[PDB]
Design a protein around this ligand. Structure first.
Ligand SMILES: CCCCCCCCCCCCCCCCC[C@@H](O)O[C@H](CO[C@H](O)CCCCCCCCCCCCCCC)COP(=O)(O)OCC[N+](C)(C)C
Ligand SMILES: CCCCCCCC/C=C\CCCCCCCC(=O)O[C@H](COC(=O)CCCCCCC/C=C/CCCCCCCC)COP(=O)(O)OCCN
Lengths: 83, 69
């Protein structure tokens, strides 16, 4: 951890472009894993209705399936309105 | 000489009888195998000469975004 500081100083003094590019690339590689917002992006992508939601035939054993779009059951996008 | 070096004729007799039986069964089995191979290559309903088809587990049975299909 002592020679690497001298190497970094020499690289910054001689070739700053490579240092900046490597720093940016490493930052972009590492940070998305630690970011808690990636799951929000995935959920937003999953919540986009490109195609029609085909209704399900009622067999009398669907308590979690809404009978109307305004019924309280089903997925809710309230978390998106606050984001 | 006969007592020391050789055996009785019945020994050779029964030995060659057993050999003949074995060879006859082998010949019959070879002919039957040829016939079975011919039939199962012609028809294809046997275990051998089975050529792969497309697995039906790859099909997706879900709504396809269009009503007809
Ligand atoms: C009596 C005097 C006057 C007459 C002389 C007659 C001369 C006859 C002697 C010459 C022998 C001819 C050689 C033929 C050898 C046959 C080999 C084989 O067939 O024998 C096998 C066994 O071999 C025999 O034991 C004889 C082997 C001896 C080999 C002969 C070599 C002698 C030559 C002398 C060499 C001298 C060397 C000197 C060094 C300095 C039998 O197999 P096995 O399945 O088990 O037995 C079946 C019968 N049973 C089941 C009833 C027992
Ligand atoms: C696994 C991570 C990958 C993702 C990040 C990288 C993304 C893309 C960026 C890299 C692009 C390709 C870089 C190619 C490297 C070539 C190096 C080379 O051989 O060039 C040397 C010159 O380069 C050097 O000096 C040797 C290497 C210098 C340092 C290289 C990077 C070391 C690490 C820097 C960043 C460290 C981490 C960031 C810390 C930031 C500070 C807190 C030759 O010099 P010339 O210009 O050809 O001729 C000169 C004479 N006329």
């Amino acid at each position: 951890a002592g020679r690497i500081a001298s190497f970094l100083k020499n690289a910054w003094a001689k070739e700053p472009v490579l240092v900046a590019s490597f720093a940016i690339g490493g930052l972009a590689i590492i940070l998305p894993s630690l970011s808690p917002y990636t799951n929000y992006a995935i959920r937003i992508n999953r919540a986009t209705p490109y195609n029609y939601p085909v209704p399900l035939r009622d067999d009398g054993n669907m308590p979690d399936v809404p009978s109307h779009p305004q019924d309280p059951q089903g997925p809710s996008l309230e978390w998106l309105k606050n984001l | 000489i006969a007592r020391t070096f050789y055996d009785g004729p019945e020994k050779n007799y029964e030995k060659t009888m057993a050999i003949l039986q074995i060879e006859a069964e082998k010949a019959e089995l070879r002919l039957k195998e040829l016939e079975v191979r011919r039939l199962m290559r012609a028809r294809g309903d046997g275990p051998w000469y089975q050529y792969p088809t497309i697995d039906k587990a790859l099909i997706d049975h879900s709504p396809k975004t269009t009503p007809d299909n």
